[PDB]
Design a protein around this ligand. Structure first.
Ligand SMILES: *[C@@H](CC(=O)OCC)[C@H](C[C@@H]1CCNC1=O)NC(=O)[C@H](Cc1ccccc1)NC(=O)OCc1ccccc1
Ligand SMILES: *[C@@H](CC(=O)OCC)[C@H](C[C@@H]1CCNC1=O)NC(=O)[C@H](Cc1ccccc1)NC(=O)OCc1ccccc1
Lengths: 188, 188
């Protein structure tokens, strides 16, 4: 059955409530002070984390080599506590999955779990008017208030919720290589 | 940890979406064509069950011997399918419980699970102006849309959600003897 225990352990140690000009989002912390949030949350230079105003030291809105929105923004936060490192739970590659759970952590829903069933590598999505790539789809009627929600199976954190049409929900993929230590250049 | 599997098996086989003049409620089916719903759903002589209009053959608004609201209404429904008999999962007596789950099945939330933690035998509640008895309390900020939601621990179905003040949630108890086959008299 659905990996509720795994979902709950991720929610407990690795989510915070984030709030921007656009409202509240579930926020998954990945390692150190690095977390993710859907790009359309429109992150600025400060953000509320569990109602504490917090400096955004870095924010990268991911796009692929076709210059198309992936709907993931990676943020680095000025806070004291480090997130438990969960990069080993991120999938290496695109894939399809069985029996996933969607978990939400907002002020309205501090702890909620939704089995969304089978998750398919969907690809292209016109996301409320923005072309977007690398989308996962599940047949569940997801709602406003669930963006940022964490999509897991047992042992894998696979995406964060970003959209729905009333019948399906859509998550942006998380891939291991989004977060590898690496060597870089000028990005803003 | 929380008995998510048990909660899910109850939701799968024993809940329907019920809709009255007051809106949608999670509805737990108990045995045969007998189900429960919070009294303030204000059940009439027909009700929608999964959007199918359905005759209410009987509705009993439970009150205790002090003539006080228990907030449970037991209904008998004119439908073809029998509910799986779950009376053996109902507690015999009032009690306190650990690590409970609150499960909701409405159109907006067809399948949602919320760990509400410790559940205490609370007693008297002024429920939005109606004196009410035999209430369970959990420290979780429950919301509109969750009434009727099923409160379980592993192996026990213990109540249905009926109220909250923004910080706590309140469920009406379910006791085994509410549903025993019995011999009766004139009740309307
Ligand atoms: C999540 C964000 C939100 O509600 O707004 C501020 C918190 C929301 C979830 C979505 C709404 C209906 N059902 C759902 O599962 N996502 C969106 O509204 C999304 C735009 C957005 C905004 C902020 C952050 C991330 C994304 N737009 C959307 O879902 O449009 C509907 C759609 C989707 C796919 C195909 C066609 C139409
Ligand atoms: C559930 C019913 C509802 O939303 O209305 C139509 C579907 C709702 C849940 C409650 C609302 C805020 N947080 C919650 O967990 N219950 C009530 O609103 C309840 C009256 C009612 C109506 C229909 C069916 C059952 C019960 N009233 C209520 O909760 O009042 C607030 C309160 C509670 C306890 C002490 C003080 C004040």
């Amino acid at each position: 059955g659905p990996g509720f225990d795994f979902a709950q352990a991720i929610m407990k140690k690795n989510t915070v409530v984030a709030r921007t000009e656009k409202g509240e989002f579930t926020m998954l912390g990945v390692h150190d002070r690095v977390a993710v949030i859907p790009t359309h949350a429109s992150v600025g230079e400060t953000i509320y984390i569990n109602d504490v105003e917090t400096k955004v030291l870095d924010a990268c809105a991911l796009r692929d080599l076709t210059d198309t929105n992936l709907e993931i923004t990676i943020v680095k936060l000025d806070r004291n506590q480090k997130f438990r490192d969960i990069r080993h739970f991120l999938p290496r590659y695109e894939d399809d999955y069985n029996d996933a759970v969607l978990s939400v952590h907002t002020s309205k829903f501090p702890n909620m779990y939704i089995p969304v069933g089978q998750v398919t590598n969907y690809g292209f999505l016109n996301l409320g008017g923005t072309p977007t790539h690398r989308i996962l789809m599940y047949n569940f009627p997801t709602r406003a208030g669930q963006c940022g929600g964490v999509v897991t199976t047992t042992g894998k954190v696979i995406g964060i919720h970003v959209g729905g049409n009333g019948a399906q929900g859509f998550a942006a993929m998380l891939l291991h290589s989004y977060f590898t230590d690496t060597q870089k250049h000028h990005h803003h």
